[PDB]
């Protein structure tokens, strides 16, 4: 028969989801499945294109779902949120559930190069708290006796993060240490 109980055997979507961008698409769908099979036990694979017409065209995107999450672990080492291919002329991008990359912190990153030695990591939070909600606060200091002068920050909304730039990048500590200050979103 045919029925979409949504949970005929698996009462949890704790399996695994994968998203790919810029895939050769030089082969068929079934054949494509084989490629993902090398990462574990696949289950459902769908490739987008939309009747492969002119207005749409195969966007080279494919998402696969597995049945053995344990097997999916290996795939992470094989690709993870960041993957690198030869680069000759056959690039493909494989990432797993961008919504739960786990490395959501990287989603919003700020980089500071020159900061006052009298700056602590949590202390940095205080200044950034003036902007909005902060996900993570990081500072780099050396046991030389003071902070080497570098800091990393993670900010909920990129827009809010941009504000920090104006507060630092467009201000500089020309009063406490008398030196330009640079802060920019990671890339």
From Swiss-Prot:
It is found in: Nucleus; Cytoplasm. The modification N-acetylmethionine is found at residue 1. There is a cross-link at residue 109 (Glycyl lysine isopeptide (Lys-Gly) (interchain with G-Cter in SUMO2)). The modification Phosphothreonine is found at residue 4. Ubiquitous. Residues 16-99, 108-187 form the RRM domain. Transmembrane segments: none annotated. Coiled coil: none annotated. Disulfide bonds: none annotated. Changing residue 63 to L: Does not reduce RNA-binding. Abolishes ARE/EDEN-dependent deadenylation. Induction: Up-regulated in myotonic dystrophy pathophysiology (DM). The modification Phosphoserine is found at residue 179. RRM1 and RRM2 domains preferentially target UGU(U/G)-rich mRNA elements. Component of an EIF2 complex at least composed of CELF1/CUGBP1, CALR, CALR3, EIF2S1, EIF2S2, HSP90B1 and HSPA5. Associates with polysomes. Interacts with HNRNPH1; the interaction in RNA-dependent. Interacts with PARN. Belongs to the CELF/BRUNOL family. RNA-binding protein implicated in the regulation of several post-transcriptional events. Involved in pre-mRNA alternative splicing, mRNA translation and stability. Mediates exon inclusion and/or exclusion in pre-mRNA that are subject to tissue-specific and developmentally regulated alternative splicing. Specifically activates exon 5 inclusion of cardiac isoforms of TNNT2 during heart remodeling at the juvenile to adult transition. This is CUGBP Elav-like family member 1. It comes from Homo sapiens (Human). The lineage of its organism: Eukaryota, Metazoa, Chordata, Craniata, Vertebrata. The chain holds residues 1 to 187 of 486 of the full protein.
């Amino acid at each position: 028969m045919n029925g979409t109980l949504d949970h005929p055997d698996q009462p949890d979507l704790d399996a695994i989801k994968m998203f790919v961008g810029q895939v050769p698409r030089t082969w068929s769908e079934k054949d494509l499945r084989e490629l993902f099979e090398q990462y574990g036990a696949v289950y459902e694979i769908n490739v987008l294109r939309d009747r492969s017409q002119n207005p749409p065209q195969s966007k080279g995107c494919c998402f696969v779902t597995f049945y053995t999450r344990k097997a999916a672990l290996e795939a992470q080492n094989a690709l993870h949120n960041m993957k690198v291919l030869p680069g000759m002329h056959h690039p493909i991008q494989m990432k797993p559930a961008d919504s739960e990359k786990n490395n959501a912190v990287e989603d919003r990153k700020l980089f500071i190069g020159m900061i006052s030695k009298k700056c602590t990591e949590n202390d940095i939070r205080v200044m950034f708290s003036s902007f909005g909600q902060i996900e993570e606060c990081r500072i780099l200091r050396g046991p030389d006796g003071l902070s080497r002068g570098c800091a990393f920050v993670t900010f909920t909304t990129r827009a809010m993060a941009q504000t920090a730039i104006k507060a630092m990048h467009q201000a500089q500590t020309m009063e406490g240490c008398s030196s330009p200050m640079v802060v920019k979103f990671a890339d």
